[PDB]
């Protein structure tokens, strides 16, 4: 069966300002099959109660999802997105970089 690994982007809803409430997003896209495991991490630990969009797909049939949580960024806190999918041997971690 032809499988496609997810693309992953980790970013904020609004431009990041330390001490200002925002949303942390992890967008996974371009993948097949649709089952996927996505976690948002704060200092390497799983953030609880993360929400996600309903499964939809692009013109090429590949799937996409948005995982998101409300957060207040600080200089000290590190955020990341951790993804597992059948195409991955181990979970892939993408760090949140304010410049990407």
């Amino acid at each position: 069966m032809i499988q496609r690994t997810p693309k992953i982007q980790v970013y904020s809803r609004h431009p990041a300002e330390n001490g200002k409430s925002n949303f942390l997003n992890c967008y996974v896209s371009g993948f097949h099959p649709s089952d996927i495991e996505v976690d948002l991490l704060k200092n390497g630990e799983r953030i609880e109660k993360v929400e996600h969009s309903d499964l939809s797909f692009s013109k090429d049939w590949s799937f996409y999802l948005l995982y998101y949580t409300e957060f207040t960024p600080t200089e000290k806190d590190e955020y990341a997105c951790r993804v597992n999918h059948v195409t991955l041997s181990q979970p892939k971690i993408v760090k949140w970089d304010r410049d990407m």
């Binding site: 069966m1 032809i2 499988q3 496609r4 693309k7 982007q9 970013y11 809803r13 609004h14 431009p15 949303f23 997003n25 967008y27 896209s29 371009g30 097949h32 099959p33 649709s34 089952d35 969009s53 309903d54 499964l55 939809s56 797909f57 049939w61 590949s62 799937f63 948005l66 998101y68 410049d99 990407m100």
Partner: protein
């Protein structure tokens, strides 16, 4: 401008973990307006845009009933495709369907769609004529013969040229505040040294709607297609979208690079440079 309406459906079998999960969503352009998930506590088609709730409870019940009937047809179709592809009942499989219509600024039908995929591969699609089929293989040819005998294309053509177009026009009017508003991108250029001989210039577009946008870098007025890193347009979560384009530039050559931004919400196109 031009607009689209699409319904998307995904069924995913999970042998030994109950019946296939069915999820369907409807969109007008890049706005999600309805959803149904068979794993919800009391599955119903739920509104996701304020302009659809005004349709009333008879509208919602008719939609919910269609969703429940499509979940059942899809479960039967997943069983049929195991037969057509000589597959065991052990693996998880996926069925996807999209259909809908595109209209121009005058609301006239530009084109209709109805297409299916199995395990992420094309299965059968209604052609642009709304009268003939493209089957991907000899299994989908069995469905083509069945649909030709039952004149399914004619039924789809009637829906696509009729209700699809009319109801899209209706939603565009009822949701005109949002569906007919283009939010331009908020833009800026960032600079990041990589080494003492090169730096990255990143051109940003944020807060725009619809998702369609063109972001490019030029050097001395020449497009840098091969050398530009272009991320997929991504949702911000507040209806808007984001995108960036980056180029690696030799130190001291920054002034020669211009970022070009085209989007429906802009008074007209932008030409940006790294400012400091």
């Amino acid at each position: 401008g031009s607009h689209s309406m699409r319904y998307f459906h995904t069924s995913v079998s999970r042998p030994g973990r109950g019946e296939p999960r069915f999820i369907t969503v409807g969109y007008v352009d890049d706005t999600l307006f309805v959803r149904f998930d068979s794993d919800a506590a009391s599955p119903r088609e739920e509104p996701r845009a304020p302009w659809i709730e005004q349709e009333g409870p008879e509208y919602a019940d008719r939609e919910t009933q269609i969703c429940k009937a499509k979940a059942q047809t899809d479960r039967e179709d997943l069983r049929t495709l195991l037969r057509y592809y000589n597959q065991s009942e052990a693996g998880s499989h996926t069925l996807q369907n999209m259909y809908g219509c595109d209209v121009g600024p005058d609301g006239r039908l530009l084109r209709g769609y109805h297409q299916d995929a199995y395990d992420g591969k094309d299965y059968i699609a209604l052609n642009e004529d709304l009268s003939s089929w493209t089957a991907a293989d000899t299994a989908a040819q069995i469905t083509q013969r069945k649909w030709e005998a039952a004149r399914v294309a004619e039924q789809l053509r009637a829906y696509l040229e009729g209700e699809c177009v009319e109801w899209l026009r209706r939603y565009l009017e009822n949701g005109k505040e949002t569906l007919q508003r283009a939010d331009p991108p908020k833009t800026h250029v960032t600079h990041h040294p990589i080494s003492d001989h090169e730096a990255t210039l990143r051109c940003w577009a944020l807060g725009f709607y619809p998702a369609e946008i063109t972001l490019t870098w030029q050097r001395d007025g020449e497009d840098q297609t091969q050398d530009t890193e272009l991320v997929e347009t991504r949702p911000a979560g507040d209806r808007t979208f984001q995108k960036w384009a980056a180029v690696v530039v030799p130190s001291g050559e920054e002034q020669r690079y211009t970022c070009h931004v085209q989007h429906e919400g802009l008074p007209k196109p932008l030409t940006l440079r790294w400012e400091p």
